[PDB]
Every structure is written in structure tokens, then in C-alpha cells.
Amino acid sequence: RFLKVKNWETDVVLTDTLHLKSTLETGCTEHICMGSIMLPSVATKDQLFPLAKEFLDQYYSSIKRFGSKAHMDRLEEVNKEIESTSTYQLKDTELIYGAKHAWRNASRCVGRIQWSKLQVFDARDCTTAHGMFNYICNHVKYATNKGNLRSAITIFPQRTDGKHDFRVWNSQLIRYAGYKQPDGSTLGDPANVQFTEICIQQGWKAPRGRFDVLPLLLQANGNDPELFQIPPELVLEVPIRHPKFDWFKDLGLKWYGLPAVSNMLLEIGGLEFSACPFSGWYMGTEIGVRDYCDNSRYNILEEVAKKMDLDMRKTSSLWKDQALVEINIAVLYSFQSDKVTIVDHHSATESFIKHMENEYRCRGGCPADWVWIVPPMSGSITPVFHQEMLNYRLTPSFEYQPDPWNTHVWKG
Amino acid sequence: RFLKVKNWETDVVLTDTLHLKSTLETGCTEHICMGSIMLPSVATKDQLFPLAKEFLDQYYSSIKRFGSKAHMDRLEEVNKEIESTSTYQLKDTELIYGAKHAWRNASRCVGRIQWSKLQVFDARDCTTAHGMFNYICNHVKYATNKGNLRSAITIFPQRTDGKHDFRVWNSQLIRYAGYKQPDGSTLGDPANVQFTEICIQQGWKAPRGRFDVLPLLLQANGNDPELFQIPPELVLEVPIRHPKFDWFKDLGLKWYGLPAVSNMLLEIGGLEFSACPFSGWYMGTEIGVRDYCDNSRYNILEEVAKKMDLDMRKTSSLWKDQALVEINIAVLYSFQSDKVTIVDHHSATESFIKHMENEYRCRGGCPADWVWIVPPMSGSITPVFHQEMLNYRLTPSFEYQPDPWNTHVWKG
Ligand code: HEM
Ligand code: HEM
Ligand SMILES: Cc1cc(N)nc(CCCN2CCC(F)(F)CC2)c1
Ligand SMILES: Cc1cc(N)nc(CCCN2CCC(F)(F)CC2)c1
Numbered sequence: 001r002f003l004k005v006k007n008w009e010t011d012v013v014l015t016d017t018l019h020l021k022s023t024l025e026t027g028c029t030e031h032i033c034m035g036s037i038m039l040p041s042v043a044t045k046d047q048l049f050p051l052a053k054e055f056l057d058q059y060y061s062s063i064k065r066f067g068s069k070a071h072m073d074r075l076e077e078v079n080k081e082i083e084s085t086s087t088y089q090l091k092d093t094e095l096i097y098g099a100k101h102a103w104r105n106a107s108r109c110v111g112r113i114q115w116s117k118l119q120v121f122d123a124r125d126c127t128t129a130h131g132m133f134n135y136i137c138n139h140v141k142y143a144t145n146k147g148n149l150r151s152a153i154t155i156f157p158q159r160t161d162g163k164h165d166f167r168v169w170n171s172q173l174i175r176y177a178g179y180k181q182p183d184g185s186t187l188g189d190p191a192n193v194q195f196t197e198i199c200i201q202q203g204w205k206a207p208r209g210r211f212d213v214l215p216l217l218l219q220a221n222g223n224d225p226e227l228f229q230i231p232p233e234l235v236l237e238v239p240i241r242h243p244k245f246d247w248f249k250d251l252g253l254k255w256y257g258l259p260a261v262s263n264m265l266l267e268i269g270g271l272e273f274s275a276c277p278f279s280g281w282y283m284g285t286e287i288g289v290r291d292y293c294d295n296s297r298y299n300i301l302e303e304v305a306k307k308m309d310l311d312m313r314k315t316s317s318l319w320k321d322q323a324l325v326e327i328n329i330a331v332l333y334s335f336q337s338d339k340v341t342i343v344d345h346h347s348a349t350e351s352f353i354k355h356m357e358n359e360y361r362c363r364g365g366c367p368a369d370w371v372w373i374v375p376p377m378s379g380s381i382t383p384v385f386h387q388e389m390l391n392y393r394l395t396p397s398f399e400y401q402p403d404p405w406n407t408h409v410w411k412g
Numbered sequence: 413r414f415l416k417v418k419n420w421e422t423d424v425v426l427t428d429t430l431h432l433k434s435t436l437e438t439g440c441t442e443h444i445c446m447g448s449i450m451l452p453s454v455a456t457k458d459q460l461f462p463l464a465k466e467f468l469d470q471y472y473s474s475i476k477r478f479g480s481k482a483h484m485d486r487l488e489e490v491n492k493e494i495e496s497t498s499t500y501q502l503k504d505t506e507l508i509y510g511a512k513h514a515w516r517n518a519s520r521c522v523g524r525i526q527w528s529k530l531q532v533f534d535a536r537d538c539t540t541a542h543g544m545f546n547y548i549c550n551h552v553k554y555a556t557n558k559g560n561l562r563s564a565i566t567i568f569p570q571r572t573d574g575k576h577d578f579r580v581w582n583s584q585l586i587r588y589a590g591y592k593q594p595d596g597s598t599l600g601d602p603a604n605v606q607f608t609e610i611c612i613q614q615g616w617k618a619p620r621g622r623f624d625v626l627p628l629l630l631q632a633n634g635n636d637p638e639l640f641q642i643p644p645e646l647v648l649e650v651p652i653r654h655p656k657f658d659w660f661k662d663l664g665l666k667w668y669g670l671p672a673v674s675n676m677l678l679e680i681g682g683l684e685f686s687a688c689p690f691s692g693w694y695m696g697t698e699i700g701v702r703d704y705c706d707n708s709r710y711n712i713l714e715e716v717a718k719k720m721d722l723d724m725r726k727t728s729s730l731w732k733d734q735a736l737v738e739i740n741i742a743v744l745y746s747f748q749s750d751k752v753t754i755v756d757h758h759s760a761t762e763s764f765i766k767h768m769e770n771e772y773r774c775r776g777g778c779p780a781d782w783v784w785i786v787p788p789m790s791g792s793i794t795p796v797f798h799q800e801m802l803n804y805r806l807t808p809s810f811e812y813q814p815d816p817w818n819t820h821v822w823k824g
């Protein structure tokens with residue numbers, strides 16, 4: 001009823017009561033745990049009012065006006081609007097609160113110490129794909145802020161019936177293109193080979209190289225999506241160099257500064273925002289480990305090991321491990337030397353522990369997904385490795401949604 | 413009902429139906445996942461027969477004689493013995509099967525590809541702490557096999573009433589002593605400071621140094637435990653050197669060859685074996701990462717970084733990561749150069765994937781604990797990082813049990 005999580009490096013115990021407010025389901029049961037499953041598995045008007053009331057009661061509890069006159073009138077005001085319209089509209093203040101607590105509740109995010117410093121851009125007056133492009137461009141410019149990255153979200157109109165959906169078809173606002181070859185291999189980013197081809201289908205002309213920034217595929221109000229090129233002056237990039245190995249520039253690697261997710265769904269008070277691109281700043285490992293060294297991504301451990309002169313015959317020479325660390329010292333160094341905000345996995349995981357402490361103190365808990373919080377290298381030398389974490393689903397939240405090209409009723 | 417687990421590096425899917433045979437509870441519910449909780453939380457005669465029948469039905473199913481005459485007679489024979497004695501005794505063949513499947517079912521063990529090659533030593537005729545010492549000595553000698561390590565388990569008499577318990581008080585047969593100081597710090601292994609002091613209480617004379625092998629504290633048939641020194645010729649050790657850095661010998665580190673757990677409980681057909689030391693061989697990271705580099709263990713990242721000439725001022729120089737890899741290349745190299753069996757985390761995790769495949773094919777599943785299977789360094793460059801895993805509890809099994817000094821009714 002009042003569960004306990006322990007840290008096995010400091011012996012610190014914390015008591016979780018926030019999980020009692022949890023509502024959605026995890027996928028786990030009393031007899032099977034699905035904590036390593038990546039994605040465990042129209043809305044009517046009856047279901048909407050409890051979700052609205054639940055959300056309204058915590059918004060007014062947060063401005064220290066729980067159950068007052070202003071609360072009960074907005075309760076009544078939203079009920080009458082759900083009767084009238086079968087849906088409702090958030091105030092600007094409720095949207096900013098909802099968006100900030102979707103991030104706060106994001107159990108897979110190690111960066112949440114920053115959750116209250118989120119800049120929310122209301123794009124609910126948008127009606128066309130061009131309007132979307134303009135809003136997204138202003139998001140990219142604001143969030144980048146000349147390399148002093150600022151976290152932000154842009155929120156396009158909520159879902160209504162279902163066949164009128166705003167969607168960003170890119171999985172991230174800024175991604176590199178992936179082209180397969182006649183000889184079967186892959187240039188660029190293999191993750192986006194499918195999306196890179198959809199752009200070619202709709203008319204993109206590819207500069208078939210490595211780090212080619214993809215165009216935006218924007219869908220407005222259910223209509224077929226349309227292509228727009230982000231002005232290249234708006235795409236900040238960092239060339240990767242090493243502070244010891246001057247052969248590292250010869251590798252000719254670079255990465256974009258802005259991590260900006262655009263394929264998830266924002267849920268606030270039962271309303272569904274199918275297009276809500278949000279952005280922060282990178283933790284180093286996301287680029288240096290997953291992006292650069294996944295076998296099905298850029299997969300550069302091969303070459304970094306070569307140029308270091310390493311024993312690549314035997315698996316147990318740990319040459320993969322040894323090249324992995326050099327690559328991540330270089331991503332960090334390059335970003336910092338250009339004053340482009342980045343955080344190392346040691347500082348980021350310390351901050352999360354400190355954030356976890358604050359949450360248990362002033363909130364009664366912190367939903368956290370250990371499988372996703374522990375970084376993909378040097379896990380046990382970071383403090384989150386030794387921290388027990390309870391995972392549960394609170395709302396407002398960010399959720400996964402199917403890719404648009406599997407679900408969109410086309411019209412030629 | 414027939415769940416699916418995916419690998420996100422190869423896109424291989426496998427279907428799990430073994431989880432339906434699962435019985436015990438995980439700690440997770442539909443609303444909270446406890447997959448990162450380390451330890452989530454007398455036996456009467458009524459409860460014993462279903463557990464015996466369940467176990468007997470799968471033993472005879474395994475020798476291809478399910479429900480035959482020999483099965484039903486042993487079913488009857490064990491029922492009558494549970495009526496008569498309120499407990500029962502396993503045949504030698506049932507004990508060897510049970511022990512092997514407790515290992516097979518060990519969801520936190522990455523080494524299970526070896527599960528059917530387990531040497532089982534029946535010590536159920538043991539009655540005294542001296543007898544225990546002799547059995548454990550023969551286990552240590554057999555399992556070490558001059559450095560060609562062999563996996564083995566020794567099984568002392570099962571629990572009966574509860575106040576007559578056989579226990580090994582050491583957490584492992586071979587561990588290094590931990591002494592705190594007058595100046596507050598720690599020499600040796602800080603994990604065992606408590607146990608190292610209990611030995612001093614009962615009469616151990618400490619050679620207060622670093623890698624001092626602890627004595628055995630053995631408890632027979634509920635009696636107060638007694639101290640025995642393993643013959644030092646029986647404790648194989650590997651001095652750690654590096655294949656590049658000749659200053660590495662100056663560190664003066666060494667580790668024992670035999671990982672041999674002695675603090676867990678073996679459950680077979682509802683019988684409880686409170687003393688069942690089992691041993692295998694080390695995966696490199698257990699020593700080089702957890703043993704050597706945990707903040708609350710030996711904690712040598714400090715010195716290895718010094719001797720490498722590293723930028724220790726800034727967290728983001730990844731000097732911890734860089735010294736971590738060198739330490740693990742050295743543990744591997746030292747063990748292999750001495751022909752003492754060890755496995756690197758790359759080979760071990762590949763073998764587990766291949767073991768997982770075999771299990772799903774011929775068994776319908778493989779209970780696996782992702783949080784424990786992914787190694788504590790370079791996680792995402794090993795194949796288990798990208799493998800979804802279902803965790804569930806099958807029997808026979810190894811379980812945790814309280815330390816004996818918290819539960820033992822002493823008599824001066
Ligand atoms: C401020 C700097 C931030 C850092 C350092 C950070 C770091 C991370 C990392 C490393 C992950 C794991 C993702 C992966 O490994 O692919 C993650 C996940 C996530 N982040 Fe944060 N993030 C930041 C900002 C944000 C913001 C501003 C939001 C939302 C407004 C957000 C929402 C999420 C969500 C919902 C997830 C989990 C969903 C998913 O990616 O599958 N993050 N974050
Ligand atoms: C054959 C070589 C073996 C290897 C390479 C291996 C490897 C591992 C590793 C790395 C762990 C994680 C433990 C930790 O990180 O502290 C583990 C856990 C475990 N091993 Fe294996 N192991 C081996 C043999 C065995 C044997 C022979 C048994 C039993 C007869 C066994 C039973 C277990 C159990 C029950 C656990 C989880 C319980 C726990 O330690 O908390 N292992 N193993
Ligand atoms: C805002 C932000 C900051 C950051 N530092 N990193 C990320 C990465 C999120 C990765 N996540 C992968 C799965 C998905 F595609 F479904 C959604 C995106 C996002
Ligand atoms: C047989 C074996 C082989 C191996 N390579 N490694 C181990 C380590 C087990 C670690 N595990 C920690 C928690 C515990 F103490 F509760 C029980 C022991 C065991």
C-alpha cells in the first residue's frame with residue numbers, strides 16, 4: 001500500500017505513495033513481468049468527463065485552489081461543453097500544466113529534473129500543413145537558441161473524430177536520411193530507410209549521401225501529407241572530433257544538436273494530441289552509443305577499432321568496449337567546444353537521482369523505468385544502476401501511436 | 413495467452429507458452445512493475461503433495477514415461493510417505509533433475525546455456541559441521557579442476573521442522589575479508605565487513621590485510637556454527653596483470669577463480685534445501701566492474717585513472733569509463749593466460765541468446781530477467797540489450813533466504 005524502493009549503493013530508502021494515483025495498466029501481472037517489452041499492449045463522450053474531472057481536480061490542487069468556486073465552475077463549464085460538443089477545449093493554463101506533467105510523468109525519460117522548465121507553444125489554431133511547417137520552424141529556432149538549447153513543445157489541434165488527425169510523419173523533426181544500395185548495404189541512417197523512401201515517393205529529391213537532413217512530412221486535419229525543407233540555417237550541427245586523436249576528424253562524423261521527438265501522442269484530461277513535437281538536449285550516449293554503434297544503425301565500431309590499432313581477432317580483447325569510450329569522449333568534447341548543450345551520462349544520471357529524491361519528498365513518488373533509465377554504457381558506475389525504481393502510469397502522459405502510413409486512409 | 417518477445421537488433425520474434433506453467437508471483441501487478449526491485453516479497457503437509465505431484469509429473473514427462481506404471485507407483489509411494497512422515501525423500505535421479513532445473517529456471521543467470529552440465533553432489537547423509545567442511549572441500553577441489561572449472565552443486569539435508577537447518581553462513585564459499593579501520597575507511601572487501609566480524613566474534617584470528625580468504629562458518633542440524641579454514645592449496649587465485657600496461661602488476665590485485673554461491677535456498681517438489689552451495693565460472697565483468705569498481709566495493713577507478721594519466725577534474729572526460737575498460741581487459745587476460753576458465757561479457761551474452769532460442773524451441777520459453785542479464789558495462793553493444801525478455805517464476809528454483817544470524821535461536 002505504501003511501497004519502498006532502496007538504493008543499494010547508499011542504502012537510502014524512499015517510500016512511494018504516488019503509485020496509488022496510478023490509473024493505466026503496465027502490461028505486467030502477478031505472474032509475468034513485462035518490464036523489458038518495448039511496447040506492451042475513437043473515444044466517446046461518457047468516458048471523457050471522469051478523465052476531465054480527474055485532470056481538473058489536480059490542476060486546481062496545484063494552484064492551491066482545490067474545490068473552490070473557480071474550480072467547481074470550470075468543472076461545470078467543461079461538463080456542459082462535453083454534453084454540448086461531446087468534447088471540450090483546454091484553457092492556455094491547463095494546456096501548459098498538462099504538457100509539463102506529461103513530461104514529469106514520463107517514466108522512460110532520464111532528463112526530467114528539467115520538467116517545469118518547458119516552453120509550450122500553442123498551435124491549436126493551425127489548419128494547414130504550411131501552418132504546421134511555420135510553427136515547427138519557430139520551434140526549431142527557439143529550442144536551438146544558438147546552441148544554448150531550450151526545451152519546448154508545440155501542440156497542434158487535438159483529435160476529434162479520428163479521420164481528421166494532425167500528424168508529423170517524421171519520427172523526429174531532424175533526422176538523417178537512410179538509403180539502401182544496389183549492393184545491399186546502407187548509406188546514412190538505416191533506421192530511416194523506410195521513411196527516406198516515403199519522402200522519395202511523395203516527391204523528395206535525395207542528395208543520396210550520409211548526413212542528409214530529411215524533409216518534413218506534415219499532415220493537417222486528416223489530409224494527405226506534404227513536404228517542406230527546414231531552412232538549413234535552422235539545423236545546427238556539430239562535427240565530431242577527438243581531444244587526443246587527430247585522425248578522428250578524418251572519420252567525418254557529425255550529428256544534429258536538437259533531439260526533437262515528433263511521433264508520440266500527448267494525452268491531457270482525456271484529450272488526444274496526435275501531433276505534439278517536443279525537444280530537449282542530448283545525453284551523450286544517445287549519439288555515441290546507440291546512434292553511432294548499434295549494429296543496425298551507423299555501426300562505426302569497425303572503423304574506430306581499426307584506426308586505434310586494436311586486436312579485433314578475439315572477442316575478449318574488449319576492443320568494442322575500448323572504441324566505444326573514445327567515441328563518447330569525442331561526442332561530448334565536440335558539443336561542448338561548440339557551446340552546444342549536451343549532458344554526459346554521469347551528470348544526467350546523478351541529476352535524475354536528485355530529481356527522484358525531490359519527487360518522493362514533495363510528490364510521494366517518481367515513476368521510473370529502470371530498463372530505460374540506466375544508460376547503454378558503463379551502467380553500474382552510474383548511480384541509477386543501483387537505484388530500485390517503481391514503474392507506473394500516471395496522466396497526463398505521452399503515449400506511443402502507430403506510424404501514420406499504416407493507418408491513413410489515402411486518396412491518391 | 414501465447415505472448416511474443418521481439419529482438420530489436422535482428423527483428424527475430426519468439427512465442428512464449430512456457431509462462432503458462434508459471435506458478436509463483438512476480439511482485440508486479442497490472443498497475444505497478446517491480447522489475448528493478450532486488451528482493452520483492454514452516455511448511456505443512458497438505459501443501460506438500462500438489463508440489464510433489466507437480467514435480468513428479470514433469471520428471472517422468474522428461475524421461476518420456478509420463479503417467480506410466482512407474483510414475484503412478486512413485487506418485488502413490490510419495491503420497492503415502494507424506495501421509496506417514498508429513499514429508500518425503502527424493503530419489504538420487506529426482507535430486508539431480510531438480511537441481512539442474514533450478515538452474516535452468518534461474519531467470520537472473522546469464523550462464524544457463526550450461527544448465528544440463530551440472531555435477532550434483534548428494535550430501536543428504538551429512539550430520540555435523542565437520543562433515544559439511546569435508547563435503548565443501550571436495551566440491552571446491554572438483555569444481556576448480558586445476559583451472560578447467562566445472563560447475564557443481566552440493567546439497568545438504570533438507571529442512572524438516574525449521575529449527576534444525578543446515579546453513580552455510582558465508583554468502584560465497586570463497587570471499588575476501590573486509591576490515592574497517594580506526595580512521596573510518598575499509599581494507600579488503602567492504603561487502604563482508606559484517607561477516608568478517610562475525611568470524612572474529614566466533615574466534616577467527618584475522619590476518620588483517622586485503623585479499624584474505626575468509627573461513628567457513630558451517631551450521632549443522634540447527635546447531636551453532638563452527639569455523640574451518642579451507643586448505644589454501646584448494647583456493648585457486650589469479651593475479652591481475654595487463655597485456656599493455658606493466659604498471660598494472662604494481663596495483664597488486666588478484667581474485668579467486670571459483671564463484672560459489674552458498675546463501676541461497678534450493679526448492680525441489682516443495683522440499684527446501686537451506687544449504688546447497690553451487691559454483692560455475694566467472695563472467696569477466698563480475699570482477700572487473702562490480703567487484704573492483706563499485707563505490708561500496710573495492711573502488712579502484714580512482715587509482716587506475718591516476719596511473720593512466722587521465723583528466724579527473726571533469727566528469728565529462730569519461731575517465732571512469734576509460735579506466736573501466738582497461739580493468740576488464742586485464743581481468744580477462746590474466747585468467748586466460750593462467751588457463752583459469754572465464755567468459756567475456758560478449759561471448760556470455762551471445763551464448764545466452766542462443767540458449768534463449770533453444771529454450772523457446774524445445775521448451776516453449778525461457779524466463780529471463782533483463783535487469784540482471786544485461787551486463788554492467790557496454791550494455792547496448794551486447795545482443796541481450798536488444799532482446800525483449802519475459803520474467804516469470806518456474807519450479808524447481810533457487811530462492812533467497814534471510815541471513816542466518818538474523819534468524820538463528822542461539823544458545824551461547
Ligand atoms: C531536457 C533534456 C532531456 C534529456 C537529457 C532527455 C533524455 C532522455 C533520454 C536519454 C531518453 C531515452 C530515449 C532513448 O534512449 O531513445 C528520454 C526519453 C523520453 N523523453 Fe526525455 N530528455 C530530455 C527532454 C525531454 C522533454 C523536454 C520531453 C517532453 C516534453 C521528453 C520526453 C521524453 C519521453 C516521453 C521519453 C520516453 C518516450 C520514448 O522516447 O520512448 N524528454 N529522454
Ligand atoms: C557456468 C558458469 C556461470 C556463469 C558464467 C554465470 C553467470 C551469472 C551471472 C553473471 C549472474 C549475475 C549475478 C551477479 O551479477 O551478481 C548469475 C546469477 C545466478 N546464477 Fe549463474 N552463472 C554460472 C553458473 C551458475 C550455476 C552452476 C548455477 C546454479 C547451479 C547458477 C545459478 C545462478 C542463480 C540462481 C543466479 C541468480 C541468483 C542471484 O545470484 O541473485 N549459476 N550467473
Ligand atoms: C526530447 C528528447 C530528448 C532526448 N535527449 N532524447 C530523446 C529521445 C527519445 C527517443 N524515443 C525513441 C522511441 C520513439 F521513437 F518512439 C520516441 C523517441 C528525446
Ligand atoms: C554460480 C555463480 C557463477 C557466477 N559467474 N556468478 C555467480 C554470482 C551470483 C551472485 N549473487 C548475488 C546475490 C546473492 F548473494 F544473493 C546470491 C549471489 C554465481
Ligand SMILES: C[C@H](O)[C@H](O)[C@H]1CNc2nc(N)[nH]c(=O)c2N1
Nearest residue numbers: 385386387388448449450783784
Ligand atoms: C537496483 C537494481 O535492481 C540493482 O542494482 C541490480 C540491477 N541489476 C543487477 N544485475 C546483476 N547482474 N547483478 C546485480 O547485482 C544487479 N543489481
Ligand SMILES: C[C@H](O)[C@H](O)[C@H]1CNc2nc(N)[nH]c(=O)c2N1
Nearest residue numbers: 036037038371372797798799800
Ligand atoms: C529489448 C529492450 O527493451 C530494448 O532494447 C530497450 C532496452 N532499454 C532501452 N533504453 C533506452 N534508453 N533506449 C532504448 O531504446 C532501449 N531499448
Ligand SMILES: [Zn+2]
Nearest residue numbers: 028033034445
Ligand atoms: Zn513487470
